[PDB]
Design a protein around this ligand. Structure first.
Ligand SMILES: CC[C@H](C)[C@H]1O[C@]2(CC[C@@H]1C)C[C@@H]1C[C@@H](C/C=C(\C)[C@@H](O[C@H]3C[C@H](OC)[C@@H](O[C@H]4C[C@H](OC)[C@@H](O)[C@H](C)O4)[C@H](C)O3)[C@@H](C)/C=C/C=C3\CO[C@@H]4[C@H](O)C(C)=C[C@@H](C(=O)O1)[C@]34O)O2
Ligand SMILES: CC[C@H](C)[C@H]1O[C@]2(CC[C@@H]1C)C[C@@H]1C[C@@H](C/C=C(\C)[C@@H](O[C@H]3C[C@H](OC)[C@@H](O[C@H]4C[C@H](OC)[C@@H](O)[C@H](C)O4)[C@H](C)O3)[C@@H](C)/C=C/C=C3\CO[C@@H]4[C@H](O)C(C)=C[C@@H](C(=O)O1)[C@]34O)O2
Ligand SMILES: CC[C@H](C)[C@H]1O[C@]2(CC[C@@H]1C)C[C@@H]1C[C@@H](C/C=C(\C)[C@@H](O[C@H]3C[C@H](OC)[C@@H](O[C@H]4C[C@H](OC)[C@@H](O)[C@H](C)O4)[C@H](C)O3)[C@@H](C)/C=C/C=C3\CO[C@@H]4[C@H](O)C(C)=C[C@@H](C(=O)O1)[C@]34O)O2
Ligand SMILES: CC[C@H](C)[C@H]1O[C@]2(CC[C@@H]1C)C[C@@H]1C[C@@H](C/C=C(\C)[C@@H](O[C@H]3C[C@H](OC)[C@@H](O[C@H]4C[C@H](OC)[C@@H](O)[C@H](C)O4)[C@H](C)O3)[C@@H](C)/C=C/C=C3\CO[C@@H]4[C@H](O)C(C)=C[C@@H](C(=O)O1)[C@]34O)O2
Ligand SMILES: CC[C@H](C)[C@H]1O[C@]2(CC[C@@H]1C)C[C@@H]1C[C@@H](C/C=C(\C)[C@@H](O[C@H]3C[C@H](OC)[C@@H](O[C@H]4C[C@H](OC)[C@@H](O)[C@H](C)O4)[C@H](C)O3)[C@@H](C)/C=C/C=C3\CO[C@@H]4[C@H](O)C(C)=C[C@@H](C(=O)O1)[C@]34O)O2
Lengths: 342, 342, 342, 342, 342
């Protein structure tokens, strides 16, 4: 009897056809699909893509599946039965490849309401290639988008609509080590025009903000320290050229290395990153320090002690100048990027 | 005759249906599942996931499979027969992808007791994404969790229960090169609430403790050595500025490199790692050493021999001071992290 | 009735055979295929290949599929039905491996016009091995080619023709981080002669131009800076040999490192890259600077003050000479590669 | 007729059942299986696993397959026929994943003797995770083990036995770039006890010895050279502090780098590697050299020429001492690890 | 009618059996197979394997497929039909894994001549593990071999023969960035003896020669340059110890780094590479230069000006000596490896 009902509803009997669209030659089937995202992982600037595995819940009703037989409002069909019924055909457009998880049983959940409402749920792993603007790199906000489109049928045949309440849910305990996701999530329609015809698509937005802890600790602090080293360099007498030339050279080299280190993590990009203007100014200051020492030597290795007194003056006034120029730059710098954002 | 019994029990005859849940429209099927874990491998902080391949043994009884025909209490069915019978549908929630091992035969073991108890065993390889807190990195205890949930049916239909005795077993000879697993294993229920309904889950806990041998040998000892180099630097006369500036610079650079080296292995993280406070203090001491030499020079390059005597005093008192401040820091440091843990 | 038409047109009835070519033993089937390319990604010089995922739209008409039954000009058949009809067999020749995207439904779109025109669309991910000439590396234009050939039948049986209008389309918002694609796209026939017979092929051209921003910021500027360091080195008195030897050595070493850094990204290649002539000249200038200092010392460590005056002359005239020789080289250099291209 | 015999022996006729074990409800089936190993490849200490692809030849007789029809002692059945007959189910326990090679035809060889002896051969690629002890790393002997167990049936049902003569064969021309395999091969039974029951297993042993050429050339020689540099450092007068401090520092730094270099290849391990005691002693000697120079300076920068004469004595006696202490250490070192092994 | 002929020739009618070998119980089937290689790619010394994707064309005639029905000499069967006919079973022995390309249609080409000659063509991607001798690394000739063997049947059943004319063809435009392939190609039989029996194999030879451009530009030139730096070092007066010690140390360090750099690309190997003798001699010369400076100091820091004159003599005679010893070594070196090869 219970098997007999799976056989009666879905059997060849009643002439049910998998291939034919529900309510065919008529109003477009409306699919309400909401996604529950388990995790973001392996977000890489260089690879340019981010991994997310999601439950996809799509709901479409067809009149023909509706049954008067059982008391229960919704009956849970077997996962295999699902291969038999018509399914809405939905591919991630930017998907860059994706896979089901078939571990143990195939992971799929389907249930038919007596009304004829169908609930269909699948667990997918997605790699998604999102374009991301690095115009200001360290502290930027990046938007990651996923758009679900129907490759099979045109606009008149099929439509996608987000669920009116709670269209995208996130894991209760989900955190990203590198970025923080924002509670506010934008959802917006799109319509794709292709040579073949117009295909429906719906896209979610995700907003992610870069954690400043790691970059502060790694990128900025050593720069600050190295810049301190020039400052301590100034106090040593000009008579010892090696100590000054040694500090200047060593510091400029280290700044070079520190600068490349930032570059290795990132994808190769034409426009100047904020990190680059920071490195350019730090390097400009150490180079200017060595430059000042060079000028002091040009005056000192030249001649008369009156000039050497002049140079002992420029030493003090310089040592007072550099922390001020660096500090004022720093102040002027932080406001634009980390304050009044967007 | 023996084939005739596989054909009689599992045949179309008797109207056995694969798709229908055992004891349908009634008390939820109870699955007692215990796992035997062959190995942990490729645990990587950066990838954030750990590999484990496990035997999964799940036991559920259904009345309809029960047979009075044979003398034997448990009969071992063919591995293919398994595709025909109803199986409890169980997916690892955090699985991040997983695969069966089909090498030679498909690796699956099933047996039916005359009572109707079914024993079902499969060999799976799992990658598992466990969130791990690095708040104190080198010596931390990390908890790795795996939760088994039923994607197919709600709470009223199906339930998972760990076996009362020996729910998780480990290989007799299993060792992890990086961590040690703890004999005490916590097992605790969870219930998942999703928009679709409430799904049963059961989760194991694994506790892993970081081996301090490698990090002691690699991370800490070279730091100690480099800090010794400042100490030997102090004894050289202040008259030779290059030897002192050379030692100070070289040591601070090496400390910088040593510090980055720790960072390369780890995933990028916002909160300060214990290794970082260690590096910060070591670097602070070498920098303070160079700083003291700079002050000594400010007094020395300045003027009168009374001051130079003053500086020869500060040399000795400093050389006595640094091992004490470093030693007291070290003592104060170890207690918090490696003593009175958690 | 609607199922009955899928059954009538494609049924065993009417004796339709999948295996037989349309209009068999006659004029070669003509396939008009246009591709819509979603993205280029992971273009790597070292791996030598570039990833592109494309929609492939191929159109061939066969008389036998044509139907008089429906009012609609084009009817959209089910994606599975596609396995039944004869398909033009088309493999990417240089494909180096490729995969369909079967996520959710298999992603395939097919429709039959009453005329008998068939539209067939598939979404594919391609890795493509394109040979690329590095003769001038940093600023080069690279051509990436994909050729679609029929492995199954000879020229007399089958032919490929690009669509007369809009044979290749690109995503409206598509950008490549490393290169820019050019609007002008060349399309040209090819015919392959193999021992078996002659097979049709059609190949698209893509032209890509290297972004000069990243290489300017990374490769060239540090070179400029390091070359500046020699210039500042000259001013320090020759009396201090260490400062001069220190600057010369340090700079030549850094130039060595900078040079290798360029090499690591690129595939190993026999012919000299433009970047290499740039590095060779920069290194030649720093080496020549140190060389001049060495000559100055050979005169200076030798003897009489008249010679030392001679050397103080060569210092000034040299410091005036080096920026001129470097600047004139730079000017002479840029014209060939970034100006009057091809 | 020849097809008729495949149809008669393996047909539904005679009531042959694939699922049922040979000689069912009786003495355990005995499988004699010998392996021919094509190659070892990609043996990596860090990944901890080694690749081997093997032919597996397993022989079990069943009475029912035996035929009186043909003259030939052994008849070669079609590779597909193999799917129909019962196969012994054998999975590599530590397999960590493995794959068949299906290129061209599926690669499988089966033949049935009239006696009823069945020869079954398959070509498999295995990744095998072998635990390996690094207690003395550079020159160690490592044992790699593969154990073949039956996941399907208990001890009473099935048994594995190595072939009495030539159970494991190796390719005639097989060589490993990193290790050498030893002709003597140990083969030993194991029995696995699991909660389900006792399962048969048979394990091969492979013994591999590390090639000392590469590590001698790479690891040890540069250490020797750097240690020579301290020796040449001693001869330079103590009056020039920079040359001595320069050599001491530079050499200790280089030793640090050389030491890390060894570490990068290896998996992270708690226990001290032999390479580490070697590095510790080399570094101890360079550090002791710099230390002696520091003491000499403490005496020299202090005061009276009688002390400076004392120091010129300690220079000579030291320069005589260091090659002796290093040489005697070297001698004492090599004996334990490369002599009287195990 | 045309379908009726596929049904008549290959139908169950006429009692055609896929499983049975052509001309069974008789003279061994003779397969003439020629390969057309599209590309070599990703040849890596470290991975030890090289990728090649090839068309495999194998020709065997069977009497039973021969038909008198059509006028055409050769008829092209459908790619699926191929699964039905008997195929020669041919696996690459060293294949290390390989895959078909199933993109769009499965890529397979088959045609049956009325004579009964069958032409069968498949497109395969192969990874091939070739053993390669590095005894002289930079400029070596390496032979890469692929051997095609029949795993299914013995010598008496099946045989492989290369096509008498043009057995291996190469792409008209094929080039390898790292090596050049030689027009002369050796083809030679092999017979494999295994415990099971004797299996036929045929192997192609490929000869590849290393491009000297990249290694000249990268490996050798910087060595030459660094060796020049010692030469320029000699001219500086011995009075400044730091400039000489600085140049000697810096150069020996850089030589160390340059030496390791070569090692990173290559697989770990016991026997001494030619590149190693080159590095050993270069390093020996820089070390000998520093050594000579040390001796000069032992004489100079010692005492009387007559000795200092002696040392100013050894300076000149040395500076004349080193370019000669290095040049004569270079000459003596190149002849063995790049001249009179093999
Ligand atoms: C003339 C430069 C000399 C050598 C000066 O160098 C120094 C010191 C003083 C010298 C006189 C140091 C140098 C920076 C320069 C000053 C330059 C800048 C602050 C910026 O660059 C300028 C010019 C540049 O166009 C030549 C321009 O880019 C274009 C590219 C695109 O158009 C096609 C477009 O997007 C738009 C038009 O922008 C830029 C906007 O503006 C800044 C971008 C450069 C930073 C420099 C660096 C950043 O990572 C490098 C690395 O970390 C390293 C090793 C050293 C750094 C350095 O060496 O920093 C570094 O190379 O000062
Ligand atoms: C002012 C710093 C100057 C340059 C001082 O530098 C030195 C020497 C003396 C200078 C005056 C050396 C420097 C450390 C500083 C002292 C700083 C610390 C001990 C710590 O940082 C402070 C400030 C920091 O917030 C600015 C704060 O982080 C926040 C981040 C998050 O909020 C958004 C939150 O999680 C919480 C609020 O915590 C921290 C807790 O506390 C410590 C974290 C820094 C260690 C420094 C380093 C660790 O890896 C780096 C690397 O190995 C390297 C190359 C050098 C190191 C270094 O250069 O170490 C390094 O960069 O002293
Ligand atoms: C004699 C050289 C001495 C050591 C000189 O070195 C320096 C300084 C002065 C010394 C006297 C520095 C050196 C370059 C040389 C001058 C050489 C060139 C400008 C070029 O090379 C010459 C000769 C070379 O054939 C020996 C020839 O290649 C052939 C190869 C192929 O035939 C089989 C064919 O394609 C065609 C015939 O071309 C070339 C065309 O032309 C240039 C190619 C070399 C650049 C050098 C380098 C580029 O990356 C290297 C790296 O960044 C590094 C660490 C240092 C660089 C360097 O060390 O640069 C570097 O190694 O000058
Ligand atoms: C006090 C050390 C000072 C800094 C001394 O450092 C130097 C010079 C003189 C200083 C006074 C140099 C230093 C070694 C020390 C002497 C130490 C050893 C020879 C060994 O270590 C000792 C102590 C160590 O337990 C603290 C102990 O490990 C335990 C770990 C486990 O228990 C939990 C267990 O398995 C068992 C109990 O063993 C060890 C057995 O025995 C040796 C192991 C250390 C070698 C050092 C190094 C090896 O790779 C490192 C790297 O290449 C580098 C950059 C420098 C090396 C160095 O710096 O070498 C290095 O760090 O001497
Ligand atoms: C005693 C050596 C001292 C330290 C001398 O070092 C220097 C300078 C002068 C010192 C007195 C420098 C040193 C080489 C030596 C001279 C040695 C050689 C030219 C060669 O080696 C000798 C001895 C060696 O067996 C100990 C032997 O190998 C065996 C291995 C196998 O048997 C089991 C077998 O295959 C066969 C018997 O061959 C070899 C054939 O012959 C040469 C091979 C060594 C080259 C050295 C190096 C190559 O890459 C290394 C790297 O780039 C680096 C950082 C420095 C190099 C170096 O340091 O080079 C380096 O380590 O001279």
């Amino acid at each position: 009897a219970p098997s007999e009902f799976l056989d009666k509803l879905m059997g060849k009997v009643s002439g049910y056809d998998a291939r034919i669209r529900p309510n065919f030659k008529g109003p477009p089937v409306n699919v309400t699909c909401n996604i529950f995202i388990n995790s973001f992982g392996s977000i890489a600037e260089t690879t340019m893509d981010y991994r997310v595995n999601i439950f996809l819940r799509q709901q479409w009703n067809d009149p023909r599946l509706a049954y008067s037989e059982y008391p229960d409002d919704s009956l849970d069909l077997d996962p295999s039965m699902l291969d038999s019924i018509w399914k809405p055909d939905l591919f991630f457009a930017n998907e860059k490849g994706a896979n089901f998880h078939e571990v143990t049983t195939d992971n799929k959940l389907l249930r038919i309401s007596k009304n004829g409402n169908v609930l269909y749920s699948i667990r997918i792993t997605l790699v998604l290639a999102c374009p991301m603007d690095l115009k200001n790199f360290p502290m930027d906000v990046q938007t990651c988008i996923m758009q679900l489109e129907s490759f099979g049928y045109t606009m008149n045949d099929l439509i996608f609509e987000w669920d009116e309440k709670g269209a995208v849910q996130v894991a209760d305990g989900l955190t990203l080590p590198q970025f923080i996701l924002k509670e506010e999530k934008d959802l917006r329609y799109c319509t794709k025009h292709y040579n073949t015809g117009k295909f429906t698509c719906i896209e979610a937005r995700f907003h992610l903000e870069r954690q400043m802890g790691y970059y502060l600790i790694q990128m900025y602090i050593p720069s600050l320290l190295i810049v301190i080293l020039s400052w301590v360099s100034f106090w040593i007498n000009m008579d010892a050229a090696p100590a000054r030339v040694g500090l200047g050279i060593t510091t400029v080299l280290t700044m070079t290395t520190q600068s490349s280190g930032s570059r290795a993590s990132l994808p190769k990009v034409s426009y100047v990153k904020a990190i680059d203007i920071w490195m350019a100014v730090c390097l400009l200051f150490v180079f200017s320090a060595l430059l000042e020492y060079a000028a002091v030597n040009f005056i000192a290795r030249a001649g008369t002690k009156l000039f050497i007194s002049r140079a002992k003056r420029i030493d003090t006034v310089s040592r007072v100048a550099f922390p001020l120029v660096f500090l004022i730059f720093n102040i002027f710098y932080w406001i634009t990027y980390k304050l009044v954002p967007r």
